[PDB]
Ligand binder design. Structure first.
Ligand SMILES: N[C@@H]1[C@@H](O)[C@H](OP(=O)(O)O)[C@@H](CO[C@]2(C(=O)O)C[C@@H](O[C@]3(C(=O)O)C[C@@H](O)[C@@H](O)[C@@H]([C@H](O)CO)O3)[C@@H](O)[C@@H]([C@H](O)CO)O2)O[C@H]1O
Ligand SMILES: [Mg+2]
Lengths: 217, 221
C-alpha cells in the first residue's frame, strides 16, 4: 500500500487551527474488525516517534484532546484545534492493514513575532591554536525569521572562503532560531591579521549588528 | 516500565554486513509482534519488516525494498530482537528503531506501535572512524554565552551535555556540517555572568562510534 501525506510542511502561529492529510492507495477499513488501521505518530527533532492516534480516531493514553484523527477508507486527517510550542515535530501516518507503511510526513513549523538576534563572537581557543588550528565563531542567538546573513571582515576586507553556517532547529520553547558562522583558518593565516569582524544582517533592522575583536588582545 | 534499547550501530564499510540488537523488558516479549523501522537523516520513517508473536509461530515479513537483504529474528529467552543487515550501501545509512508491534493473541490489542527504542545510527562509508576534538568557546554584561566547538569527527553522531546534564537551560546545539570527510558542530549555553567563572561550567561530548567521551572545562581567558 502506498501512503502519501500533505502538506510536506506548513507554518502557523500558536493558537491557530491546523490540518494535515493522509492518503492510501488501498482502503484501510478492515471489514472484519470494522476499524481503519491508520495511526498518527509525532516525532520531535532528535527523538523517537510517539503514538498519538490509532484506529484513525482513537487517542492514545496521555495525548491531549487538541489532537483529533478523522477520516475513513483511503482519506484521513489529523487535526490540531490549537497548536502550541510543543507541537514542533514531523507527523507521520501509518497504515497497518497490510503489513505496515509510513507516509511521507508533515513537518509542523510555528510562526511568531520577529526577533533580533543576540550576537557573540569567539576568538580561537589556545588549545586549537596549539595544534595549528584557528576557528573564529560568530554566534547569532534566538532570532526570527530563520533567514539571516553574516559578513566576515578581516582587517576591513570581506572574507568568503573558509566560512560555514549552521542553524539549530526551531526552539521547542519560544520557537526561535540560533545559528553559528564559523571561519576556519590555519594558525598562520590567523596570525597574519589583527581585526576580526562578523556582521549580522536580519529583517529586524537595516543596520547590521557588528561584533569584533583584535588578535592583539 | 516498558523499555527498548537498540545496539550495534556505528560505521560499516560499503558491501559489508551488520547485526543490530533490540534488548527489551517490562512486558511479555513472546506476546508481541516486533517491528524494525529506519530513517535516513532528514528523511521519512520506513517500515522494514516484523516478526510475529509465539501464537503466530514467529513468522517474518519484510517491505519490498529490503527483501532478501535484511533479516529479522528474536531470542525469546533473553527477550532480544535482532536485525541482520547484509550487503550495505550508503542508502542504508540511517537511524534504526525497534518498536513493539501488536499483540492480537493475548491482552490488550490495538493497531499501533506503543513503544519505541531510542534508535541507533548506522552509517555506511569507506571512511575512517575518528573521535572529535573539543575546543572551548569563550568571550574575547548580566549574562555570558559559552560553548564547545566540536571538530573532525566521523561518523555521526556526537551528543553534548553541560555540567553532566545538570545545566539544561539556555542550551543551543546547531546542526552538524560535513566538510572534507569530517563533521563539526557547536553547542552553546547562556548563563548569568554571576555563575561563571565563579562556578564550574563543563561540556561533555560523546561520540558513540569510537566509544569515546570527552569533557571540556570552560576556563576564562
Ligand atoms: N480474512 C481473514 C479473517 O476471517 C480473520 O479474522 P477472524 O478470526 O475474526 O475470522 C483474520 C484474523 O486476524 C488475525 C487474528 O488472529 O485476529 C490477525 C492477523 O494479523 C495481521 C498479520 O499477522 O499479518 C497483522 C495486523 O496488523 C493486520 O495487518 C492483519 C490483517 O489486516 C488481517 O487481514 O494481519 C493475521 O495474523 C491473521 C491470520 O493471517 C489469519 O489467517 O489472524 O484473518 C484474515 O485472513
Ligand atoms: Mg511469512
Amino acid at each position: 500500500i502506498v501512503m502519501t501525506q500533505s502538506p510536506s510542511s506548513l507554518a502557523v502561529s500558536a493558537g491557530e487551527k491546523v490540518t494535515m492529510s493522509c492518503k492510501s492507495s488501498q482502503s484501510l477499513l478492515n471489514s472484519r474488525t470494522r476499524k481503519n488501521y491508520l495511526a498518527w505518530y509525532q516525532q520531535k527533532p532528535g527523538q523517537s516517534p510517539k503514538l498519538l492516534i490509532y484506529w484513525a480516531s482513537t487517542r492514545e493514553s496521555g495525548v491531549p484532546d487538541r489532537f483529533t484523527g478523522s477520516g475513513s477508507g483511503t482519506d484521513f486527517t489529523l487535526t490540531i484545534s490549537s497548536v502550541q510550542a510543543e507541537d514542533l515535530a514531523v507527523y507521520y501516518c501509518k497504515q497497518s492493514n497490510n503489513l505496515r507503511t509510513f507516509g511521507g510526513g508533515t513537518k509542523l513549523e510555528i510562526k511568531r513575532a520577529d526577533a533580533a538576534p543576540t550576537v557573540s563572537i569567539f576568538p580561537p581557543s589556545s588549545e586549537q591554536l596549539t595544534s595549528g588550528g584557528a576557528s573564529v565563531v560568530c554566534f547569532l542567538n534566538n532570532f526570527y525569521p530563520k533567514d539571516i546573513n553574516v559578513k566576515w571582515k578581516i582587517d576591513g576586507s570581506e572574507r568568503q572562503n573558509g566560512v560555514l553556517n549552521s542553524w539549530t532547529d526551531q526552539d521547542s520553547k519560544d520557537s526561535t532560531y540560533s545559528m553559528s558562522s564559523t571561519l576556519t583558518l590555519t594558525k598562520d593565516e590567523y596570525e597574519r591579521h589583527n581585526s576580526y569582524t562578523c556582521e549580522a544582517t536580519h529583517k529586524t533592522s537595516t543596520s547590521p549588528i557588528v561584533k569584533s575583536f583584535n588578535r592583539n588582545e | 516500565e516498558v523499555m527498548l534499547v537498540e545496539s550495534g550501530g556505528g560505521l560499516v564499510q560499503p558491501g559489508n554486513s551488520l547485526r543490530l540488537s533490540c534488548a527489551t523488558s517490562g512486558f511479555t516479549f513472546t506476546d508481541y509482534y516486533m517491528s524494525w523501522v529506519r530513517q535516513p537523516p532528514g528523511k521519512a520513517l520506513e517500515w522494514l519488516g516484523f516478526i510475529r508473536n509465539k501464537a503466530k509461530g514467529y513468522t517474518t515479513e519484510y517491505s519490498a525494498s529490503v527483501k532478501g537483504r535484511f533479516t529479522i529474528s528474536r531470542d525469546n529467552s533473553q527477550s532480544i530482537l535482532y536485525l541482520q543487515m547484509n550487503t550495505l550501501r550508503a542508502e542504508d545509512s540511517a537511524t534504526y528503531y525497534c518498536a513493539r508491534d501488536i499483540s492480537p493473541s493475548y491482552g490488550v490489542y490495538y493497531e499501533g506501535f506503543a513503544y519505541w527504542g531510542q534508535g541507533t545510527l548506522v552509517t555506511v562509508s569507506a571512511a575512517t572512524t575518528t573521535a572529535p576534538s573539543v575546543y572551548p568557546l569563550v568571550p574575547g554584561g548580566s549574562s555570558v554565552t559559552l560553548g564547545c566547538l566540536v571538530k573532525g569527527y566521523f561518523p555521526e553522531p556526537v551528543t553534548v551535555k553541560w555540567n553532566y546534564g545538570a545545566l539544561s537551560s539556555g542550551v543551543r546545539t546547531v546542526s552538524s556540517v560535513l566538510q572534507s570527510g569530517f563533521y563539526s558542530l557547536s553547542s552553546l549555553v547562556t548563563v548569568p555572568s554571576s555563575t561563571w567563572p565563579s562556578q564550574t561550567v563543563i561540556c561533555n561530548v560523546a561520540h558513540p562510534a569510537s566509544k569515546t567521551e570527552l569533557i571540556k572545562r570552560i576556563e576564562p581567558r
